[PDB]
């Protein structure tokens, strides 16, 4: 039975094979299918966007009660208020009129989404036939909306990616102009060019439509020759776009933090502090053990509050819970974690293409300064050498400051908070970047600098060591593959050497700076691991450094304070248990025990065969499966990263509890 048993392990091996999570890969799809897939998802995205609109209705058009508050719509409510579809009004009439508008935009997105899905099926199946005029169209050569195509594109379509830039830019100016008309005609916002009103978003919707159209014609006549090697392969271009989109998303996250709490954005974001929100899963009106409410009601029982019915979600004061910043932290963090994730994948899917060329030898044939200036091994170890040195001199300079501040605050080794770095704060030149600048701001800048250079090491290694490294050229070895776990025990072992594993060590290392953001935007103290504890000098910070605000907690005391509100909620606490349960299970597949599970699975499948035969008359052969290391490090990073930030949501959605009253010394 050895052979049959081996045909199975062979059915689950570390060698190249087809996997369910690689079927929509760029390699097996032509350029007509990428366009078709993007269209079908935007149709689904419109269907999704139309559900975030129906959910926002508080009172239905017929006047009856609607939906309870939910986080999906909350992150978009300040935008629909800004555009006039949604309105913050106590009057039930405004609440009933508003609901009709959201329902109308939801049905509209249902119609347009259905068109994009239809226009995404025919493109995918190359069945792009006009149902009215029997004649079909050509992807390579088409008129592009008839007469409009002839005047601007000389009646021709782009045959190469570098050419598609001009037409794509022209298509963008038709959206910039298209939105500038929707705002003017449907939403009633005329283009007044003053940057304190929503009317400025129509004026710049036309300025941008002019810049892009002019820029889209210059690239039609003069397509850029930069990164020509990308025009040859889809994944090469798709990865540079993803490395670019991630920095774009991080930028969007950073401006939505500065802007959403500007005075001009007060009518939409700060305005929320004066609203009562019934969030789902929040503590409801409790009832007694012997509580039976019959037709007569309130008989032979008792209930909590008595100002609301049994099992009804209780109100929540926006000012107390800090709703404004909670929403501002949920949007800013979303576009930052995603931005970081996009950058990591751009480098991964990019080095995934650098491996394909090194194997085929096209690497030495590239002429772009974007690859040529990076094929020298001496130059690589210099770039990586400086990145590692900078990462070290900055992770040790800022960690020792945080540790020293912690030691001074806890009076360890007879040291008072006076000897700590309370005098160190950002220089005067940078003081404009921060409100009430302090050591909490000097540390955060250096932590992000150290947290970027740390995860950059794993990225420079994907870019430079996809096929070979100075060590494996020394050890005479080839990295044939992007997802190979290790070469075995040899040379003290060589686990985690592929670029997919280096991607994992960028996501795992990126959890620190991805947490220095969560902690810093929630008004937490980052200069000390212990701030505000009932101990020696933790509460002396607000007056030793003269801070205008009072931070919620320090790195360690953050978990205790922020979770007082999590434990009070029956749903925020379910996330705390699920999120922790998912995270530890990563250790089972990330620890070097893949072999043990396999011999264990053998005993599992042997015992089941034994029990089934001794009890029943049938033969139970299930051949218990076990994941491979590369398949383990995959699921391991998804359980680790995916459970780590299932709970970061709880820190941001539990409320914003930074104040404006610095504490006096606990003298």
């Amino acid at each position: 039975d050895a052979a049959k048993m081996r045909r199975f392990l062979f059915q689950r091996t570390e060698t190249r094979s087809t996997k369910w999570y690689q079927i929509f890969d760029t390699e097996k799809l032509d350029d007509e299918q990428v366009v078709g897939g993007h269209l079908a998802l935007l149709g689904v995205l419109g269907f999704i966007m139309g559900i975030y609109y129906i959910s926002g209705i508080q009172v239905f058009p017929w006047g009856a009660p609607g939906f309870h508050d939910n986080w999906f719509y909350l992150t978009i409510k300040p935008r629909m208020v800004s555009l006039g579809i949604d309105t913050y009004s106590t009057k039930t009439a405004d609440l009933e009129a508003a609901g009709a508008r959201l329902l109308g935009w939801a049905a509209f997105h249902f119609l347009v989404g259905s068109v994009l899905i239809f226009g995404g099926w025919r493109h995918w199946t190359h069945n792009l036939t006009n149902p009215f005029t029997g004649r079909c169209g050509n992807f390579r050569d088409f008129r592009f909306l008839g007469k409009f195509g002839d005047v601007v594109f000389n009646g021709t379509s782009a045959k190469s990616y570098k050419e598609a830039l001009g037409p794509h830019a022209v298509y963008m100016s038709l959206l910039f102009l298209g939105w500038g008309i929707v705002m003017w005609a449907i939403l009633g916002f005329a283009p007044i060019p003053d940057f304190q009103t929503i009317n400025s978003e129509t004026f710049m919707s036309f300025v941008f439509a002019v810049i892009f159209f002019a820029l889209g014609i210059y690239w039609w006549n003069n397509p850029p020759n930069a990164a020509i090697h990308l025009n040859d392969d889809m994944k090469a271009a798709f990865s540079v776009h993803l490395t670019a989109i991630g920095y774009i998303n991080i930028a969007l996250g950073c401006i939505a933090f500065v802007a959403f709490q500007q005075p001009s954005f007060a009518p939409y974001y700060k305005e929320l502090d004066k609203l009562v929100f019934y969030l789902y899963g929040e503590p409801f009106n409790r009832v007694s053990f012997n509580f039976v409410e019959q037709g007569g009601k309130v008989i032979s029982g008792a209930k909590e509050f008595a100002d609301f019915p049994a099992y009804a979600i209780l109100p929540k004061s926006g000012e107390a819970f800090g709703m404004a910043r909670v929403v501002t932290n949920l949007i800013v963090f979303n576009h930052i974690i995603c931005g970081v994730l996009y950058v990591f994948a751009g480098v991964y899917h990019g080095g995934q293409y650098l491996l394909k060329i090194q194997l085929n030898g096209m690497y030495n044939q590239i002429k772009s300064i974007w690859i040529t200036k990076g094929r020298d091994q001496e130059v690589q170890v210099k770039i990586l050498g400086t990145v590692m040195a900078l990462c070290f001199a900055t992770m040790l300079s800022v960690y020792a400051v945080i540790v020293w501040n912690t030691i001074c605050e806890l009076n360890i080794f007879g040291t008072n908070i006076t000897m700590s770095f309370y005098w160190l704060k950002p220089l005067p030149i940078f003081q404009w970047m921060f409100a009430d600048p302090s050591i909490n701001d000097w540390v955060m800048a250096h932590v992000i600098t150290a947290g970027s250079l740390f995860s950059l090491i794993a990225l420079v290694r994907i870019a430079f060591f996809a096929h070979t490294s100075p060590l494996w050229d020394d050890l005479g070895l080839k990295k044939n593959s992007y997802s190979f776990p290790c070469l075995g025990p040899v040379y003290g072992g060589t686990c985690g050497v592929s670029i997919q594993d280096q991607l994992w060590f960028a996501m795992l290392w990126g959890i620190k700076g991805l947490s220095a953001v969560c902690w810093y935007i929630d008004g937490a103290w980052i200069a000390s691991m212990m701030y505000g504890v009932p101990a020696a000098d933790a509460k002396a910070w607000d007056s030793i450094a003269h801070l205008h605000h009072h931070y919620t907690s320090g790195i360690f005391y953050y978990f205790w304070t922020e979770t007082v509100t999590i434990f009070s909620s029956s749903h925020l606490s379910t996330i705390l248990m699920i999120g922790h349960l998912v995270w530890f299970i990563s250790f089972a597949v990330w620890f070097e025990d893949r072999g043990s599970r396999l011999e264990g699975a053998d005993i599992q499948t042997r015992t089941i065969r034994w029990l089934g035969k001794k009890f029943l008359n049938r033969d139970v052969n299930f051949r218990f499966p076990v994941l491979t290391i590369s398949d383990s490090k995959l699921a391991g990073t998804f359980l680790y990263f995916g459970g780590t930030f299932m709970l970061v949501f709880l820190f941001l959605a539990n409320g914003f509890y930074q104040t404006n009253s610095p504490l006096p010394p606990p003298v």
């Binding site: 097996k28 799809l29 032509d30 050569d141 190469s160 990616y161 392969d233 030898g361």
Partner: protein, 359 residues
């Protein structure tokens, strides 16, 4: 306002020792042809059938149906080419030449000899893929055209008179044999046409009517560029002709442009490349060098797709320019590097595009 040309290519190959491949090519161009007479249209048909395996003989046919400036022109050939030795190759065949209301038939007994100036082991050893091989070819021709028409007789009488009175007939006949720009094509492909030699010009009676007979012999040398000389063994896969092979093509041309259709199977599309690896046959150099002659007159934009289909279990080990997309068994070339190489080779470039596919 801007010229454009569209084209589609396709190669399907079998596995094992088979060199059999199916090739389909469709092209459409918007610039005027260099031909000083338009419209000129043309359909060509080639069929090769193996007669016997041991002899190595094969029967090849060719039909040309072209209308040039409303003048119907047809040339028909039926011949029996076989391998005699490594350098000699004898062909016996018959054909017909018709222009408008004029037509004449011919029968030929011919042999071609091909020698390489040198044959060194070091080249062979040090070179994995040799492109240029220096050589020369010698044709023995015994033409048999019956003088049925009044005009044929006059062309023959005139020819004999010209030979008799002009000493420079062997030299100045090369000005007639290569008419208009075909003569400039000679220097272009690095091909030298030597002077013809007339063994005999004797009229011999035939059952139908007097038959002018010519027995001539000529030679021509290739600097290495010429494919007939450099690749003498590869252009005749007679022994690989297990089943009949046909190449069918045609084209339409006029002031507006050229429309071309080509299709057919034949062996020799795939050749061994060493180390167990197979490879598509090296592109013929003479066609590219000959098309650069007419392809450099109009600035054009290239829209070409090359679909290559490989055998089950057979994947490519290396290609430059690299395939834009892969889809299971088939691999696709379009855009980017490939549509630079097409603009390169459509204007006369001969840059290498190599595909290596191993089992």
């Amino acid at each position: 306002d801007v010229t454009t040309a569209h084209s589609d290519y396709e190669i399907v190959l079998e596995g094992g020792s088979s060199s059999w491949g199916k090739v389909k090519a469709r092209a459409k161009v918007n610039a005027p042809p260099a031909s000083p007479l338009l419209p000129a249209d043309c359909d060509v048909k080639l069929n090769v059938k193996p007669l016997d395996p041991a002899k190595g003989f094969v029967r090849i046919s060719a039909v040309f149906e072209s209308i040039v400036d409303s003048t119907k022109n047809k040339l028909t050939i039926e011949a029996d080419i076989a391998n005699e030795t490594k350098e000699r190759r004898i062909s016996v065949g018959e054909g017909m030449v018709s222009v408008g209301d004029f037509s004449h038939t011919f029968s030929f007994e011919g042999s071609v000899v091909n020698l390489f100036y040198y044959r060194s082991d070091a080249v062979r050893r040090n070179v994995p893929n040799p492109i240029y091989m220096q050589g020369r070819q010698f044709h023995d021709i015994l033409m048999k055209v019956p003088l049925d028409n009044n005009d044929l007789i006059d062309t023959w009488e005139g020819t004999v008179k010209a030979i008799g009175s002009t000493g420079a007939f062997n030299d100045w006949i090369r000005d007639f044999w290569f008419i208009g720009p075909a003569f400039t094509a000679l220097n272009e492909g690095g091909q030298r046409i030597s002077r013809i030699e007339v063994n005999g010009l004797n009229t011999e009676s035939g059952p139908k009517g007097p038959v002018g007979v010519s027995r001539w012999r000529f030679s021509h040398g290739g600097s290495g560029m010429v494919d007939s000389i450099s690749r003498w063994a590869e252009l005749f896969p007679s022994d690989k002709l297990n089943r009949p092979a046909q190449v069918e093509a045609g084209f339409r041309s006029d002031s507006q442009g050229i429309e071309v259709k080509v299709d057919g199977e034949f062996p020799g599309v795939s050749v061994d490349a060493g180390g167990g690896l197979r490879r598509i046959l090296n592109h013929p150099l003479i066609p590219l060098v000959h098309h650069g002659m007419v392809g450099k007159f109009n600035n054009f934009n290239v829209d070409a797709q090359l679909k290559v289909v490989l055998p089950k279990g057979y994947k490519i080990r290396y290609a430059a320019p690299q395939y834009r997309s892969q889809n299971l068994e088939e691999y696709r070339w379009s855009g980017g590097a490939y549509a630079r190489w097409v603009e390169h080779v459509c204007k006369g470039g001969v840059g290498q595009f190599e595909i290596l596919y191993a089992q």
